[model samples]
Target chain A: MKTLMVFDPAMDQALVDFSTDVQWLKQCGVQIERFNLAQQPMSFVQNEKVKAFIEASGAEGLPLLLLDGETVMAGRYPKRAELARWFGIPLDKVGLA
Target chain B: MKTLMVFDPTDVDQALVDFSTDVQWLKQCGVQIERFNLAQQPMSFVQNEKVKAFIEASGAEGLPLLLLDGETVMAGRYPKRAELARWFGIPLDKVGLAP
Candidate 1:
């Protein structure tokens, strides 16, 4: 499954935690693509769906998550269990419940 | 001359544009300026202990950070043209200021 994450890395602890979790997800063989509004402004502007979402909801709607080009979550990062479930990884393997 | 800038590009402001434009003048004066966006260049923030601490303490509000010769010179906002000239020791005449 292809997962796309768009988030602001300006936050302190959560940013580090999310990056760590993303690395773990990659190790599990999940294909991940990520972008941040800070550096990759074009991604937000070029992706029609994301652009529309931003227009409708604003930057506060970010930390957007999309699986296979379809949005799955926004406004916050996902929990470990949600990630495991979404990717079909066993809970035991990820070690977060 | 080492100058570093960390900023956010997601939200653009006229002041930022002006600051960026003014940076070209610094380049002409032989200042080697390095810039990293918080979203685009996460590693720079993570590796620089001082920058990292600033981010942790002040969040995004304290961005467009300026480091001059390894010292934190400005934070939370872009510097004025006069300030840049003073910091880099550029003559006022060169930066469009009169004596």
Candidate 2:
């Protein structure tokens, strides 16, 4: 029901694509919260599990996604199709199957 | 028998500076102290379960974590020597705060 995105936006260009999907999700009224590790290290530091996840996985284990506070994805960004499927939106809206 | 202090020093503001002084004073009192900086010793953050969860719940804003005998005695701010004495049950006279 909720989405949380934690990542270092400066670390990769994938954010360009991810942000597009996020904007699309917003246009569809899906609420999402975002945190960047470089700017908001507190977001990672204060989350025990997420902090541990990053520690275990290292910096490479970024772009973590949580749906309703449960991890839905980690170390990778999402495709429009995946976002659409997760949110019960139409594939036509995302233009992917 | 042990005290752990985890902090970030890149932004060494007055708080950590004061805390570092206190830490050294504590060491002079024969209190064993282990200190880690977040930028340098990141593994120390995750190595301890209590610390890991605390950081998760509180974030970096709740840093400069202090553990006294395996329990988190303080976080996010430096403590007065008086408070340190109280937590460690050190004699106030020895802590230089007897009033």
Candidate 3:
């Protein structure tokens, strides 16, 4: 399973916050790909090769979380508990009151 | 009536093209205001002075087009013909086709 966290570099807070999470994900052996939409001109180019790559790789409509090449999650920041569950981080003893 | 076109400065094509229209609008009596969303700070501060200004001025959900101090339009770029009508410009007997 792999997760591609697509974000605009112009969103400073979002980028910084997500980068911290990426480091955490790396420790858990999750394959995480970070793509900056601003620097990648190909991503913005209409009907371009980048569009082909996204389509072929099934990463369209990203912020895509793919589990075994199938979509599991997408969109804005996911809560810590949700991420823990998705990544199979045991939380049986963790209290959330 | 006033129109505030909210756009990011980084979107170069959008800014330049819109600026051309801004110049056109200036020829008329219409008031056009441009704002760069990227430049502003403390925009996320709840109940802050900036938020208060937005609230008081009723510029929330912007890209707002106001007529007679009331909301008339919002969202993405307006088509040229629609814009002309909105600005009360005269257009008549424009040729289409001979059928």
Candidate 4:
């Protein structure tokens, strides 16, 4: 399944933001779709396809994340270990476990 | 503690280096600067006690971490113009541009 991240690159993403958590995905299989609200035209956010997802989730915040078109998280970035766990990889490897 | 940086190579970093962002910020702020290539730098030092958590936090998202006085002040990207004042919590009018 495809994973999508609807992010506002200008908010908490200054110099501390990453596209995805590292090695958290070493074995977990998924793709990242970055929807940058700042970069996209206002129309894009208003687009029925994108709006339908965001509005329904009550994700009234910056950097909303969706997994398989469902709400994985909202209002904050996901930690690598936590995200890894979310994907069922468990990060049982050394330095991660 | 000074500002130490361990950069993971990225296209944006190359551009920053080319434009002397590192040099300029270092010169203006006169803060200490350290750099280690993610691949080349030994994990022993990176995994060491003092910097391990910081590295993990930085690595979690992206790299190019800027540590100020042992705290991570920035990562993935460098602080830009308006950021200096707000980032430092200095009075906006008093925050001067880096020379």
Candidate 1 regions exceeding 4 Å error are A7-11, B1-99
- Model 3 CAPRI quality: incorrect
If the candidates were sorted by their DockQ against the true structure, best first, what order would they fall in? Answer: 4, 2, 3, 1
Per-prediction DockQ comes to: 0.02, 0.03, 0.02, 0.05
Candidates ranked, most accurate by TM-score first: 1, 2, 4, 3
> What lDDT is obtained when candidate 3 is compared to the true structure?
0.40
Candidate 3, which segments miss by more than 4 Å at Cα?
A: A1-14, A41-64, A91-97, B1-99
> Which of the predicted structures, 3 or 4, would earn the higher TM-score when compared with the native?
4
TM-score of each: 0.46, 0.45, 0.31, 0.37
Cα TM-score of candidate 2: 0.45
Candidate 1 similarity to native, TM-score: 0.46
Cα lDDT tens digits, model 4, B48-92, are 443455344323344444444444344445544344334333344
Docking class of 2: incorrect
The alpha-carbon lDDT assigned to residue B2 of candidate 2 equals 48
Per-residue lDDT over A1-97 for candidate 2, one digit per residue giving the tens place of the 0 to 100 score: 5555555533446678888888888788777778887777788788765776655444444566655564445446667766776677897665555
Residue-wise lDDT of candidate 3 within A1-97, one digit each (tens)?
A: 6443332222257556666765665566766554455566454345242343334322322343333333333323444444455556554422222
How accurate locally is residue B24 in candidate 4, as Cα lDDT from 0 to 100?
Answer: 61
